[PDB]
Design a protein around this ligand. Structure first.
Ligand code: FES
Ligand SMILES: [Mg+2]
Length: 215
């Protein structure tokens, strides 16, 4: 709300109307939202979009944990690979992110897309609340794993020197405490991307065949 200031952010579905987005689960509607998000079909069970790997994101953290091989393959392709399963969860999450962002950025003490520099990499905080001279980071949980977003937020906390951060779920909010141990994940990722050889698969079955085997 313009003119007011925010103490703490509220759950996504308590700010945006999530029910409006539950009618987005047919091929016809998918193929239209796909076009806009610049997401395309590559293989019958694989979608993709362009991704800048100078940019750290929950996408990368989620993928580093799932399968370091997948992260390397994607870095080489210059493409982010999405399973035909969770392509709708990404598109839905992106629209939810955009609405929640634009609505909370309306507060006087709230700001969207705060660019931060992590050395050779860059980060973009979903939302930043300014309680006094301190910047409280906010991470919107959409599309990827709970742990991925939570780690990402712990990085932004440790970079902004905040005392804590907010992790906004659909129907609740979580106060993530500063944990500099999450920054250790950042050194490992920087190593996987620069690795001249592909790491070993840390998954039970590749849902992205045959791409992973062919690099
Ligand atoms: S996803 Fe683990 S190797 Fe293809
Ligand atoms: Mg987020």
């Amino acid at each position: 709300f313009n003119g007011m200031e925010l103490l703490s952010p509220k759950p996504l579905c308590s700010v945006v109307n999530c029910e409006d987005l539950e009618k987005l689960d047919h091929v016809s509607a998918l193929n239209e939202l796909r076009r806009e998000q610049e997401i395309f079909k590559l293989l019958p069970g694989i979608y993709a979009h362009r991704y800048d790997f100078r940019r750290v994101s929950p996408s990368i953290i989620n993928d580093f944990e799932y399968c370091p091989r997948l992260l390397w393959v994607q870095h080489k392709l210059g493409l982010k690979l999405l399973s035909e399963k969770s392509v709708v969860s990404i598109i839905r999450g992106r629209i939810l992110h955009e609405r929640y962002e634009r609505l909370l950025s309306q507060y006087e003490n709230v700001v969207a897309e705060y660019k931060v520099e992590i050395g050779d990499l860059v980060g973009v905080v979903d939302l930043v609340i300014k309680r006094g001279g301190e910047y409280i980071p906010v991470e919107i949980k959409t599309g990827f794993s709970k742990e991925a977003h939570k780690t990402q937020l712990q990085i932004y906390i440790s970079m902004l020197k905040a005392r804590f951060g907010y992790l906004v779920y659909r129907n609740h909010v979580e106060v993530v405490h500063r944990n500099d141990a999450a920054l250790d994940v950042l050194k490992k990722i920087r190593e996987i991307l620069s690795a001249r050889e592909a790491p070993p698969a840390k998954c039970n079955s590749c849902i992205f065949k045959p791409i992973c085997k062919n690099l």
